[PDB]
From a paper:
GPI-MT-I is a heterodimer composed of the catalytic subunit Gpi14 and the auxiliary subunit Pbn1, which together transfer the first mannose from dolichol-phosphomannose (Dol-P-Man) to GlcN-(acyl)PI, forming an α-1,4-glycosidic linkage. This enzyme complex is widely conserved among eukaryotes and plays a critical role in fungal growth, cell wall integrity, and hyphal morphogenesis. Gpi14 has 12 transmembrane helices, with both the N-terminus and the C-terminus located in the cytoplasm.
Here, we report the cryo-EM structure of Candida glabrata GPI-MT-I bound to Dol-P-Man at 3.48 Å resolution, revealing how Gpi14 and Pbn1 assemble into a functional complex and engage the donor substrate. The overall structure of Gpi14-Pbn1 complex measures approximately 60  Å  ×  55  Å  ×  125  Å and reveals a 1:1 heterodimer of Gpi14 and Pbn1. Within Pbn1, we identified three N-glycosylation sites (N35, N319, and N365), consistent with observed band upshift in SDS-PAGE analysis. By modeling Dol20-P-Man into this density, we successfully obtained the high-resolution structure of the endogenous donor-bound GPI-MT-I complex. The donor substrate Dol20-P-Man is embedded within the transmembrane cavity of Gpi14, oriented toward the EL4 side, and does not directly interact with Pbn1. Recognition of Dol-P-Man substrates is mediated through a combination of hydrophobic, electrostatic, and hydrogen-bonding interactions. The dolichyl tail forms hydrophobic interactions with Ile174 of EL3, Ile177 and Ile178 of TM6, Met277 and Leu281 of TM8, and Phe308 of TM9. The phosphate group forms electrostatic interactions with the side chains of His239 and Arg242, as well as hydrogen bonds with the phenolic hydroxyl group of Tyr319. Meanwhile, the mannosyl group is coordinated through an extensive hydrogen-bonding network.
Numbering used by the authors:
A (entry chain A), B (entry chain B): 2 to 408
Write the structure that this text describes.
């Protein structure tokens, strides 16, 4: 059979409502605290803002003040679950944007078959994404913003695209990695319509100026409003961070041991160089065929995967960063079913092994630091690198039969 | 010799006072049923100053039951000083600051004779394993209180300076308006012979009440004992909230353990409240933290005792550490009652948080232990080389995958 888009949206809405009701009833009755710690931090920051005080008085709150401003109706109106409703609405908007993007792209770039329903349901019908959104995690909002600006680029709305790109860059610092590919596309996006380098260069300068001015205005406004603590906890923390808590990253034990020592080793300060090198190398592949939106989406997905894989910190909440880009990559994929099954099996097995080691360390106190955790991290990193290489091969193969249907 | 000595003999039965022998130059007592001895030494020194100091030692492993003539000392060796100009660095313990005093804490007995002002030496039988000590230093006077138990026949004679002895028995009482009845004797100044004892009655309403008899009012449980952050659960479901009664848990934690003060409303933490820094980054700042946590009546209350990461050392092993929080309910009483008794007096400590007209009911003092392992500081080179080799190989493989010809 073939699911209807309206029916798909209705069933997704029903699932969201059911999970929200589960959450509220379990919080009220069961003493398990289904709601995540991040929502508690956001609620405390919102309380501090509502009492005419700096939100950064709440420890371990390094987000932008806009999140607390958005969650202010938690205390402006006497309810606790408003942030959950806002995040669920953002998740629904993200799904609708995904569906609209696929529908628009299918009519401008030649595609294999009709697969809108399955690729939309990958995101809209995932209990994992549902749990992420309904537990107070804010990632969905960021995801929404991302899609929004990308949509503005698809319909040639470059000014709003730049504004939203600047807003997203202010929200989190990582989307800056998208600057190199997108810009190129924009130039080519005007070369295939107007044969004048002047107009394309002017449009690129315009979008760059818009995003820069939005970012700088937001930064200056926030700093002026909330003092030097905002700048510190938002920017300098990533510079002086010494994250040593167990996490999927490969640099975990190395960073822990280095933080133990008083003087960093000479061949220990280049923990940022490999990430930059691989990100730039993956970014440069956009030049293979510019003025192509599926290629841009695939490049962005590969960039996000590489950035998360090589990050100094990586937990179960970092996956969604690239999961949003999964449909566009898999619409015209050429991987055999057995290969995809192998990739999924290896991914889940490595994740399970690391999770077992971490659970042992946390809930049993066993000394599994050097031999156990490090080997699991290395295995997970190797599996992730192999998966990334396979996806790069997939996108290189894909770039061939994505011709336009221009007259 | 400018010494004043006050001796208090707390008995259990009226007939026990018959066994007391009164010889012309002393008092010989043979224990009958676990009587209590309270010795009070008072000195006069100039010591021009305007601050109070307290040195309280109670054995953490002591199982002796508290008496009506003894205050609830904080477990372990504590030194409080309300002076805001002098520096407290005795015995190499960095002080913890609070809006009322600087405090030093330890769980092992330290020498006291080096701290007593004026270099005064006296015939003190320091018995840290079987006695509780409380030294109060005022502007012009020094007081030493020693609470002990008699397990053998003892003879008291004319000690240095003026000597006064009093034997008391607790008459009918309702855990309020406590009345003691018994004998009081004094030693002549011109001879070592005792005076004529007289009947005496003492009437006082204590502000330290003990309900530790029976009836399991507030059972204490510990879950995830082996884990890094064990959970302390307190049951108050069967007890209804009163008008002026608020329950609290007071815990003195070392530098390797911290409490998230945002977990429950109305919680105060002084000292190392940082939620991210490991043990080796904040070890030299202070000795730890003092936390007072409110509890909600009618529901089970849960407290999480997180543990930091210890600095790796050779021959990896764990560093189990223990602490004993105390559960007490504080009730406010009208400012007309005289909450003063000749035995003990209010001073600096965990009572400084509350007002003067408060009464404490102590319920339970269940102890907790935490096991924290650290790795071996000899694998730094292996970890560095393996991690960097794996990362370099992965980026080389990805770069090779990137360079693939199209079509
Ligand atoms: C080409 C182009 C021009 C090169 C420039 C490119 C530039 C230089 C590389 C960027 C490198 C820098 C910016 C560090 C990234 C900072 C974090 C990556 C952001 C985010 O900070 P965190 O990940 O620590 O914060 C976490 O985020 C996750 C999100 O799920 C949450 O679950 C957590 O609770 C937590 O909030
Ligand atoms: C955070 C707040 C500010 C909201 C974020 C979402 C909006 C910024 C997004 C969501 C829906 C988007 C719109 C969806 C559809 C369209 C129609 C589209 O029109 C065309 O396709 C023009 C060509 C044609 O059809 O002839 C132009 C972009 C626009 C206005 C999009 C602009 C950006 C919008 C308003
Ligand atoms: C203080 O806590 C202890 C916890 O051990 C209580 O002692 C236990 O109480 C439970 C009832 O909840 C009994 O089933 C156990 O037999 C008791 N002993 C032990 C060793 O567990 C004690 O009752 C509490 N005291 C007060 C005054 O609440
Ligand atoms: C460190 O952890 C080890 C692992 O549990 C502890 O070893 C046992 O601890 C229990 C505690 O009751 C003892 O009864 C056992 O005899 C211990 N077994 C040994 C030492 O082989 C150890 O006690 C912990 N603390 C240290 C080593 O200081
Ligand atoms: C020992 O002391 C306890 C209280 O401190 C008392 O209840 C008990 O009766 C004493 N022992 C004897 C044998 O009397």
């Amino acid at each position: 059979f073939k699911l209807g888009t309206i029916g798909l949206l209705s069933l997704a809405v029903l699932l969201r409502i059911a999970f929200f009701l589960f959450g509220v009833y379990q919080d009220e009755h069961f003493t398990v605290k289904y709601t995540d710690i991040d929502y508690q931090v956001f609620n405390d920051a919102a309380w501090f803002v509502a009492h005419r005080k700096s939100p950064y008085n709440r420890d371990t709150y390094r987000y932008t003040p806009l999140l607390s401003w958005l969650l202010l109706p938690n205390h402006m109106i006497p309810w606790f679950h408003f942030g959950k409703l806002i995040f669920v609405l953002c998740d629904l908007a993200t799904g609708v944007l995904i569906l609209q993007m696929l529908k628009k792209l299918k009519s401008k770039y030649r595609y294999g078959t009709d697969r809108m329903t399955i690729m939309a349901a990958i995101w809209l019908l995932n209990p994992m994404v549902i749990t992420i959104s309904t537990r107070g995690n804010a990632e969905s909002v960021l995801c929404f913003l991302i899609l929004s600006f990308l949509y503005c680029f698809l319909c040639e709305q470059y000014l709003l695209g730049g504004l939203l790109f600047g807003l997203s860059i202010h929200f989190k610092i990582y989307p800056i990695i998208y600057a190199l590919p997108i810009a190129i596309y924009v130039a080519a996006a005007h070369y295939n319509k107007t044969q004048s380098v002047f107009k394309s260069s002017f449009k690129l300068f315009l979008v760059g100026f818009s995003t820069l001015i939005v970012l700088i205005l937001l930064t200056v406004f926030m700093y002026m409003l909330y003092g030097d603590k905002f700048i510190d906890q938002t920017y300098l923390y990533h510079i002086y961070r010494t994250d040593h808590r167990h996490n999927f990253s490969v640099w975990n034990m190395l960073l822990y041991f280095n933080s133990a020592l008083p003087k960093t080793s000479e061949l220990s300060k280049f923990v940022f160089l490999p990430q930059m090198i691989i990100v730039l190398a993956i970014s440069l592949t956009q030049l293979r065929r510019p003025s192509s939106f599926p290629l841009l989406c695939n490049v962005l997905f590969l960039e996000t995967f590489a950035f998360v894989t090589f990050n100094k910190v990586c937990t179960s909440q970092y996956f969604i960063w690239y999961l949003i880009f999964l449909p566009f990559v898999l619409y015209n994929t050429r991987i055999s079913m057995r290969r995809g099954i192998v990739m999924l099996v290896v991914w889940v097995a490595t994740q399970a092994l690391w999770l077992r080691q971490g659970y042992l360390l946390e809930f049993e106190g066993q000394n599994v630091f050097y031999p156990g955790l490090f080997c699991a991290s290395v295995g997970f990193f190797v599996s992730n690198a192999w998966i990334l290489g396979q996806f790069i091969e997939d996108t290189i193969i894909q770039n061939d039969y994505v011709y336009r249907i221009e007259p | 010799e400018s010494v004043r000595h006050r001796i208090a003999l707390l008995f259990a039965n009226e007939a026990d006072i018959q066994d007391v022998e009164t010889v012309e130059d002393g008092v010989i007592v043979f224990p009958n049923s676990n009587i209590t001895i309270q010795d009070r030494w008072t000195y006069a020194i100039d010591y021009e100053l305007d601050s109070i100091r307290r040195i309280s030692w109670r054995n953490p492993s002591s199982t002796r039951q508290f008496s009506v003539i003894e205050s609830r000392l904080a477990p372990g060796f504590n030194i409080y000083s309300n002076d805001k100009e002098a520096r407290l660095n005795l015995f190499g313990i960095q002080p913890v600051y609070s809006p009322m005093y600087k405090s030093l804490h330890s769980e092992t007995w330290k020498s006291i004779n080096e701290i007593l002002p004026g270099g005064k030496n006296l015939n003190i039988p320091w018995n840290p394993e079987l006695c509780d000590y409380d030294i109060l230093i005022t502007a012009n006077t020094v007081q030493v209180f020693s609470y002990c138990s008699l397990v053998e026949k003892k003879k008291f004679v004319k000690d240095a300076g003026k000597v006064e002895i009093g034997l008391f028995h607790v008459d009918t009482e309702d855990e309020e308006d406590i009345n003691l009845s018994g004998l009081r004797c004094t030693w002549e100044d011109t001879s070592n012979n005792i005076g004529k004892c007289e009947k005496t009655t003492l009437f006082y309403k204590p502000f330290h009440l003990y309900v530790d008899d029976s009836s399991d009012i507030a059972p204490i449980t510990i879950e995830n004992t082996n884990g890094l952050h064990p959970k302390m659960k307190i049951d108050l479901s069967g007890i209804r909230k009163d008008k002026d009664c608020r329950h609290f848990v007071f815990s003195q934690l070392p530098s390797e353990i911290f409490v998230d003060k945002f977990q429950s409303p109305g919680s105060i933490v002084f000292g190392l409240d940082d939620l991210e820094l490991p043990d080796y980054k904040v070890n030299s700042l202070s000795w730890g933290s003092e936390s007072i946590v409110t509890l909600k009546e009618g529901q089970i209350n849960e407290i999480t005792y997180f543990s930091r990461y210890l600095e790796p050392k050779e021959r990896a092993s764990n560093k189990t550490v223990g602490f004993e929080p105390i559960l007490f309910k504080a009730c406010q009483v009208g400012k007309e009652e005289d909450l003063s008794n000749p035995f003990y007096s209010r001073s600096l400590g965990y009572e400084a948080y509350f007002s003067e007209n408060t009464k404490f009911y102590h319920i339970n003092s269940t102890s907790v232990h935490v096991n924290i392992p650290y790795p071996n500081k000899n694998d730094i080179g292996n970890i560095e080389y393996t991690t960097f080799g794996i990362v370099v190989l992965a980026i080389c493989y990805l770069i090779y995958k990137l360079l693939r010809p199209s079509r």
